[PDB]
Structure 1
Amino acid sequence: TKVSVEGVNVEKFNVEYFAKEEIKAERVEDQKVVDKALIAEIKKTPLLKQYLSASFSLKNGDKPHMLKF
């Protein structure tokens, strides 16, 4: 399952974006820019907003050499 990603500006973040030398108020501003520019595209497809919020697990009889992802 692929989404639309082309609406997103991502080029701000590289390696150096992740140094540390209580959460930085700069970092949370980039969250919401990405997220709101993303939510839109997830809302198109049915159940995807719900699909993402859930946790993947293995269930009895899921043999993962058989399984398709």
Structure 2
Amino acid sequence: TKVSVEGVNVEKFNVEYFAKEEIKAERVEDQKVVDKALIAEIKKTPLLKQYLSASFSLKNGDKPHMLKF
């Protein structure tokens, strides 16, 4: 399953952006900007929000070599 990330501007993020040299305000602003753009596409299909809110976990009888991810 793939969402249309074309609408999200990812040019700002780079390797030096994550350098670790209370969270920086600029980081929070960028996260909010990314979330605002991504939520519109995520809600465009049913259960995508709920699906992403659910934590993946294995169950008895599950065969990862058989499960089609």
- TM-score tier after normalising by the smaller chain length: over 0.9
Gaps of 5+ in 1: none
Per-residue CA distance 1:3-62 (angstroms, 9 max, x = gap): 010000000011000112211111000001100100000111100000001100000011
CA-based RMSD of the aligned residues comes to 0.6
**Structure-1-length-normalised TM-score:** 0.96
**Which TM-score applies when normalising by structure 2?**
0.96
Tell me the number of residue pairs that the alignment of Structure 1 and Structure 2 aligns: 69
- Unaligned stretches of 5+ in structure 2? none
User: Which deviates more from structure 2 when the two are superposed, residues 17-26 or residues 28-37?
Assistant: 17-26
State the distance in 1 between where 2:26 and 2:63 align: 44
Between the aligned partners of 1:35 and 1:63, the Cα distance in structure 2 is 34
Q: Tell me, what secondary structure is at the counterpart of 2:41?
A: helix
